[PDB]
Amino acid sequence: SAMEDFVRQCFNPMIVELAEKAMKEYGEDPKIETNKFAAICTHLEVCFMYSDGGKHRFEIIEGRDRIMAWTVVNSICNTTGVEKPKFLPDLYDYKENRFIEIGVTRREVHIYYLEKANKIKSEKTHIHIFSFTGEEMATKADYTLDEESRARIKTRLFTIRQEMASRSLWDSFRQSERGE
Ligand SMILES: NC(=O)c1[nH]c(Br)cc(=O)c1O
Ligand SMILES: [Mn+2]
Ligand SMILES: [Mn+2]
């Protein structure tokens, strides 16, 4: 339908393939769970732009299969002594030496921040929440990146929102929590 066409049009093939493998990991059909499909693509794209903004400052953990994700996490923990996370995070920051969980939400950033912080329940994993409204919220108000990079992420998310809006897809997507 329209959501599947949109996702194939605004995301590059690499992200779309990773998103479809996420959907088979979950057991869900991208033709049917189209909001979750789009949310997964959007979150992948943000994680990849975040680590590109970073001499490579960030290690990408999201988007790897689980074997390779835990391999990377364990290697980081073995060479830094940073405490192992209970859930797979999204990136590792080699400058601040901490794991990062990235959240992308259609709700208020502080609501989703509280939800993430309550879930992962580790003071050491840094949380950074982005909305589709240019808002952000991060552990200790430490936004990690400089203003330019955060601006580029915010711009991309708002653009995705407006592209769905032009296709009459935004109302469905925002009223859904699927993919968060
Ligand atoms: N499986 C994950 O790693 C994951 N899942 C959801 Br739902 C939202 C996230 O931000 C995230 O990193
Ligand atoms: Mn993740
Ligand atoms: Mn995340």
Numbering used by the authors: -1 to 52, 73 to 198
Question: Paper's wording?
Answer:
Among the most important influenza virus targets is the RNA-dependent RNA polymerase acidic N-terminal (PAN) endonuclease, which is a critical component of the viral replication machinery. PAN is part of a heterotrimeric RNA-dependent RNA polymerase complex, which is composed of PA, PB1, and PB2 subunits. The PA subunit, which enables endonucleolytic cleavage, is composed of a C-terminal domain that is mostly structural and an N-terminal domain that is catalytically active. In native PAN, the Mn2+ cations are coordinated by His41, Glu80, Asp108, Glu 119, and Ile120 and five water molecules, producing an octahedral coordination geometry at each metal center.
Compounds 1, 2, 3, and 5 present the same triad and display similar binding poses, coordinating Mn1 through the ketone and Mn2 through the carboxylate, with the hydroxyl group bridging Mn1 and Mn2.21 The binding and inhibitory activity (vide infra) of these compounds are comparable to those of the parent MBP 1. The average distance from Mn2 to the carboxylic acid isosteric group in each of these structures is 2.2 Å. Interestingly, several nitrogen-containing isosteres were found to have a bridging water molecule between the nitrogen of the hydroxypyridinone core and a nitrogen from the isosteric groups (see compounds 3, 4, 5, and 9). This interaction is reminiscent of the carbamoylpyridine bicycle in Baloxavir, but creates a cyclized, rigid structure by hydrogen bonding with water, rather than a synthetic, covalent ring structure. Despite conversion from a potentially anionic carboxylate to a neutral carboxamide, compound 3 showed little difference in activity when compared with compounds 1 or 2. To further examine this hypothesis, octahedral distortion parameters ζ and Σ were calculated for compound 8 (relative to Mn2) and compared with the distortion parameters of compound 3 and the ligand-free structure, which presented the most ideal octahedral geometries. Comparing both the rotated and planar structures of compound 8 to those of compound 3 (0.357 Å, 46.669°) and the ligand-free structure (bound water, 0.685 Å, 44.571°), both conformations of compound 8 exhibit poorer octahedral character. While compound 8 does bind favorably, it demonstrates higher distortion parameters than compound 3, possibly accounting for the decreased activity of 8 compared to 3.
